Amino acid sequence: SQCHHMLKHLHNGARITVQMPPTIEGHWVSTGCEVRSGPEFMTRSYRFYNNNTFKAYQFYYGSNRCTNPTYTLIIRGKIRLRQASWIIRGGTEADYQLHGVQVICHTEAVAEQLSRLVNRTCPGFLAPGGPWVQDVAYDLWQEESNHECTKAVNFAMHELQLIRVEKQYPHHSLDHLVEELFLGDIHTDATQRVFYRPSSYQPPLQNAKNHNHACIACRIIFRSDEHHPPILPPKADLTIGLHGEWVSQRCEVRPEVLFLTRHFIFHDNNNTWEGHYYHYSDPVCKHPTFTIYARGRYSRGVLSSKVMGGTEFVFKVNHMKVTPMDAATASLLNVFSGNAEGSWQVGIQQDVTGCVALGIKLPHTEYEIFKMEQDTRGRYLLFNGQRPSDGSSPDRPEKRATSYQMPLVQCASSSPRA
Ligand SMILES: *[C@@H]1O[C@H](CO)[C@@H](O)[C@H](O)[C@H]1NC(C)=O
Ligand SMILES: *[C@@H]1O[C@H](CO)[C@@H](O)[C@H](O)[C@H]1NC(C)=O
Ligand SMILES: *[C@@H]1O[C@H](CO)[C@@H](O)[C@H](O)[C@H]1NC(C)=O
Structure with a gap:
């Protein structure tokens, strides 16, 4: 695990x-x-x-x-x-x-x-x-x-x-x-x-x-129909406990960005988070294109009034690093690197976060919605907000998601059970 x-x-x-x-x-x-x-x-x-x-x-x-x-x-x-x-x-x-x-x-x-x-x-x-x-x-x-x-x-x-x-x-x-x-x-x-x-x-x-x-x-x-709709069992709402590490359960697909997996780390001691986004060109996530490392801070949670079962967070990205994973990615980044010597190379991580590359804005603030559930095996699942379908960022409270991405599964914890 x-x-x-x-x-x-x-x-x-x-x-x-x-x-x-x-x-x-x-x-x-x-x-x-x-x-x-x-x-x-x-x-x-x-x-x-x-x-x-x-x-x-x-x-x-x-x-x-x-x-x-x-x-x-x-x-x-x-x-x-x-x-x-x-x-x-x-x-x-x-x-x-x-x-x-x-x-x-x-x-x-x-x-x-x-x-x-x-x-x-x-x-x-x-x-x-x-x-x-x-x-x-x-x-x-x-x-x-x-x-x-x-x-x-x-x-x-x-x-x-x-x-x-x-x-x-x-x-x-x-x-x-x-x-x-x-x-x-x-x-x-x-x-x-x-x-x-x-x-x-x-x-x-x-x-x-x-x-x-x-x-x-x-x-x-x-066993349901239009006159007997499915009545699902009432699972109790879990409280958000982020501390530890979470990874994609599948080769995920996002609108306009295609295939990727995610590895998130949360530190509840100081409300700092890290995300690794591993991007792929293929639907079984075997052929990598580029990797994004992001780091920052999150807020305390507020239970959503818009979305029953959801918890509202503010997430700030303060630091970003990019790793081109094929030559085509490095080539595109080098063509769009002005004054100087961006020198993008396959497998070499570069900090973007005094200036910024590709016109990326840092810091970057997002208005998030999270829920936590358990799978059939009692593993903890973490859901964050569905990415806007048009490729835009949830950068104002009114643009916070009212739905979720596919869940991450917990792979490291320091919480007890007995
Ligand atoms: C298509 O098949 C189903 C049988 O499962 C039937 O109930 C339905 O009426 C059929 N549609 C047409 C247009 O024949
Ligand atoms: C927050 O805590 C984590 C875990 O101990 C540590 O790695 C990180 O440096 C801390 N960050 C800050 C900004 O205090
Ligand atoms: C139907 O909607 C219109 C427009 O809002 C409204 O003027 C009308 O009174 C409504 N009809 C009924 C029967 O409530």
Whole structure:
């Protein structure tokens, strides 16, 4: 359980095989309570049938534990896989056609809030007698009626345009095949969701036939429908305890920056942090491009009022070092090094932090959102804020994320257990 060991052997040393071309035929489910920008607390139950049609459930909830359903969307349509993405290596592009979007409200309060929101968004949309009632499917989109108000709920289905299926086995075992469907990332800005071409992935869905055996949420969701939405178990909220070391569980994908792993170190004795960002050109993180080392200070935590389960931090970067890891990276940095002798070299670390290179601004302050959970094995998971989809920095409080990146796993600690 050394940090270096877990970075050498991502996802507990699991061997990953990529279905190329991808086979999406089957039932795929969320592995927990997902957070989309907003925030939206939701689970997915997506069925892709052999005739290339799909029925997708999006179950929405009022909290980060997904114990109290609010409304469910039932999204019907047809999907056709095109070819391997040239932008996202390991990704496969696809085209889709919506046949229908229906909404069911699971409480009176939601029926009345949602009907009001549909009316404010699309004044000419609602029927005469009064507000919507619970447990009734209302049309938000019909393929043969010409009307629609999906903008009310900030709906779009562009996630179906980028597809990756990973097959996962334990390092030395042919028992426990886990199949994961990666669909396109959801834009962090709701308004931009209608025009966004995914360049990264949502958290993976797991196949109802080949899911991790410890995935409780998987089993609950598989037995659900629009009139019985998945009720997830109420896990207790953990308090943020940063002290120690955290590493990526996977070859991560960020919008516009592609593949990377992270190694973070937190010192709670003086609120100082270090980040290593190992950047790669490939989706199994074997071919390095450049490494960023960053160091600075963080604030005390304040529980978020915007995002149930989240803790607000301010993070300041005071120091930065860059290591080009291939000749192309060193070449690009040398071409864009003015007065003098930046002398960038493969594998040689240089401090950027009296002047700065590449017009990098230091110090740099970010407004962060963190949560801590446990995996099925009782290992601690650290989530920080989803990176803005447009490549921008959360550099003002109002630009703080309302959703999370994929989690880091703790690899060093000085906290007890008994
Ligand atoms: C596609 O297949 C499913 C069977 O799982 C069926 O319910 C659905 O109606 C079929 N679609 C069409 C257009 O025939
Ligand atoms: C619907 O929205 C419009 C615009 O805000 C408002 O003027 C109207 O009164 C609303 N309708 C109802 C029935 O509340
Ligand atoms: C903070 O504490 C860590 C761990 O002892 C130490 O390495 C680091 O130098 C300290 N930094 C400052 C600025 O005091």
